[PDB]
Subunit: 101 residues, 2 copies
């Protein structure tokens, strides 16, 4: 769901910055959706950012869809040994009511 | 969704223990659903546990539903000042195919 919507990826900056990006993005008249994405330890922070937004605008911003997934990352030793690890990810789509009211 | 299903709450034990609980629980003939729950920093770990399970049984265990929420926790100073903070949570319902095959 929410294919094409702009994306806010949770990085090193303070959760406060991503909340601002989410809100600023959603305040645009022609944009009613924004997806928040994160991997690994940042997943908790993605949820925090979304919950701050949800609780501030509990009446017009809904969590439309959530998906979790994981990626297999691998490296090869020079002698041909494969070493792998999985990294989890989360994607949360937030949708604002029609426009406002 | 998945009302009534048994619950695996992600705590201090190693993610490996919760994966075992999830699988052991799902291996029961009459139980096709299990909800994984976590709050705060443990949310990343809930996702990891679920992804380990999902990738090991990618063909018969599906993520049926996911919800995130947050709780307002508060304490009162003896002089009447309220101090609050929000704690995020996640609930993931895993469902196994009919029985097996």
């Amino acid at each position: 769901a929410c294919e094409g919507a702009p994306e806010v990826r949770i990085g090193r900056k303070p959760v406060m910055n991503y909340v601002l990006a989410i809100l600023t993005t959603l305040m645009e008249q022609g944009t009613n959706q924004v997806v928040v994405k994160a991997r690994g330890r940042n997943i908790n922070r993605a949820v925090d950012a979304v919950e701050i937004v949800r609780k501030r605008f509990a009446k017009n911003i809904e969590i439309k869809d959530i998906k979790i997934d994981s990626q297999e990352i691998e490296v090869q030793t020079p002698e041909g040994q494969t070493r792998t690890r999985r990294v989890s990810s989360i994607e949360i789509c937030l949708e604002k009511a029609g426009e406002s009211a």
